[PDB]
UniProtKB/Swiss-Prot annotation:
Residues 10-181 form the Macro domain. The chain holds residues 1208 to 1388 of 1801 of the full protein. Induction: Up-regulated by IFNG in macrophages. Down-regulated by IL4 in macrophages. This is Protein mono-ADP-ribosyltransferase PARP14. A glycoprotein 3 binds at D29, I30, S41, V52, G126, T127, G128, N129, A130, F165. It comes from the Eukaryota. Expressed in macrophages. ADP-ribosyltransferase that mediates mono-ADP-ribosylation of glutamate residues on target proteins. In contrast to PARP1 and PARP2, it is not able to mediate poly-ADP-ribosylation. Has been shown to catalyze the mono-ADP-ribosylation of STAT1 at 'Glu-657' and 'Glu-705', thus decreasing STAT1 phosphorylation which negatively regulates pro-inflammatory cytokine production in macrophages in response to IFNG stimulation. Belongs to the ARTD/PARP family. It is found in: Nucleus; Cytoplasm. Auto-ADP-ribosylated. Interacts with STAT6. Interacts with PARP10. Interacts with PARP9 in IFNG-stimulated macrophages; the interaction prevents PARP14-mediated STAT1 and STAT6 ADP-riboslylation. Coiled coil: none annotated.
Amino acid sequence: MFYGTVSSPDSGVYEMKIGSIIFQVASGDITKEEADVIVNSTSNSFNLKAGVSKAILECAGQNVERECSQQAQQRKNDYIITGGGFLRCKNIIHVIGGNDVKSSVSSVLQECEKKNYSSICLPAIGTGNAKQHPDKVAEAIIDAIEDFVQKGSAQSVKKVKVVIFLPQVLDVFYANMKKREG
Ligand SMILES: Cc1cc(Nc2ccc(O)cc2)n2ncnc2n1
Ligand SMILES: [Cl-]
Ligand SMILES: [Cl-]
């Protein structure tokens, strides 16, 4: 009803259509990517500096770190939106790695529509310090995008890319795409 065909547009990159959205996966360093939004997978205090969160906060810079701690003390947040700092993006959305991954991705998609953004890049949310299982994380990410498409909510959002630290986790995402393809 929604899924296109899995193919490889460049070496190590795999893509398929989900409704109107191009969904892509690749292994690499997320801090070198360009997108309207980059997603950080962090702790409930928004000040973790381990694994992918270390790279994102170090590259983004101290003003973004400052933004995070200030919003954390203002209220209880399920996620926080900051500037991009020295990353190549318009905003960073910082989600909690231990939270429900489908819910976190659904929130990212809705916030990107609110800003009329077209591109998103995210890590394998929850597979770092939170130690959620890669198979469940892949299923949750793709389920969130399917639901967003099914509800007719995709308007500005055109491209969602997962850039993944470990090649072994990329294999799990590829297998999930092949399970779903038309
Ligand atoms: C050991 C390790 C390293 C690393 N990131 C990285 C650092 C330096 C490079 O040159 C390449 C990748 N990450 N990210 C998440 N967990 C990690 N664990
Ligand atoms: Cl995590
Ligand atoms: Cl990752």
